[PDB]
């Protein structure tokens, strides 16, 4: 089963044509892109404070070798 | 003295001209013209021509001379030859400076000189006007009159610029 990613006819009525002209002239989609980067500015960042904080690991982690004893 | 500022600027004006007129590498010749243009604007500024002075900077230096340098970098010189390396350029450059220095020295010593024609050396300020108290720039009034008085000038000037566009597209299509 499949779907089309980019197979659509734009509406050619006056309302739709005027919608695309306003987008062209008023940069609406670009302003909407500015909105998303603005919301990220006000999100808490994901940075951790290395070396005072460390990334999480699991017991299976493969690091430096060692020889063990009984 | 600052009473001789116009004369001093005109001395540098000539030195810039002897610079590019001796024709070194077109890159350095362009620099000499740029310096002369700026010095020439200062001369016009000190006679009360603020707009005309700034047009030299805006149009002559920021416009024409930019396109000259642009074209030089493309179709003439990409790397300058050492300045004054050629003997002919050095001889011409030295000769013009020697002539200029003699004019300056003699006009300053006698406050007048006869180099072909006779000039006064008292300073350019002596000829200035002594009665200005209008609430506007007279140079600005004159230039603004292009649109009221100069209808004919606008028509032929605008036409020539349009033809310049058409012409240069014909020349360069090849």
């Amino acid at each position: 089963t499949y779907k089309y990613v980019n197979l659509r006819e734009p509406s050619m009525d006056m309302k739709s044509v005027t919608d695309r002209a306003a987008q062209t002239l008023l940069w609406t989609e670009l302003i909407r892109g500015l909105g998303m980067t603005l919301s990220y500015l006000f999100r808490e960042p994901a940075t951790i404070n290395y070396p005072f904080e460390k990334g999480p690991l699991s017991p299976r982690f493969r690091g430096e070798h060692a020889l063990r004893r009984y | 003295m600052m009473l001789y500022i116009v004369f001093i600027l005109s001395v540098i004006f000539v030195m810039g001209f002897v610079g590019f007129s001796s024709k070194p590498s077109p890159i350095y010749g362009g620099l000499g013209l740029i310096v002369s243009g700026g010095v020439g604007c200062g001369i016009v500024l000190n006679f009360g021509g603020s707009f005309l002075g700034l047009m030299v900077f805006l149009i002559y230096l920021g416009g024409m001379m930019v396109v000259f340098g642009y074209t030089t970098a493309m179709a003439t010189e990409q790397y300058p030859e050492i300045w004054l390396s050629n003997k002919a350029v050095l001889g011409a450059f030295v000769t013009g400076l020697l002539m200029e220095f003699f004019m300056v020295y003699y006009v300053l010593k006698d406050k007048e000189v006869e180099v072909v024609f006779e000039f006064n050396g008292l300073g350019d300020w002596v000829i200035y006007d002594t009665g200005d108290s209008g609430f506007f720039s007279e140079e600005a009034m004159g230039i603004a009159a292009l649109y009221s008085y100069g209808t004919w000038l606008v028509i032929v000037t605008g036409w020539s610029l349009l033809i310049g566009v058409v012409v240069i597209m014909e020349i360069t299509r090849g």
Binding site: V17, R20, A21, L25 | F136
Partner: protein
């Protein structure tokens, strides 16, 4: 009327930037001739006194020329105060 309307819709869909340019340029050429305020720009420009108003020698037959600036003869700027 319709074939032109079908023409405008095509350029509005394809070249809205050029349609706006030509529309604005047309209004810049047309509206000055239609505006009722255009006549005032001429009057205001003439009402601005850049140089001294040199007085006239009084020969005894100039009843329309004021003798004093505060006399009632001569051009009035009452129209401008309201504007």
């Amino acid at each position: 009327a319709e074939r032109v309307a079908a023409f405008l819709k095509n350029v509005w869909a394809k070249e809205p930037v050029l349609v706006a340019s030509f529309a604005i340029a047309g209004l810049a050429v047309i509206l000055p001739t239609l505006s009722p305020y255009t006549k005032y720009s001429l009057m205001i420009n003439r009402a601005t006194p850049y140089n001294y108003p040199v007085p006239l020698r009084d020969d005894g037959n100039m009843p329309d020329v004021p003798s004093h600036p505060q006399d009632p003869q001569g051009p009035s700027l009452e129209w401008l105060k309201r504007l």
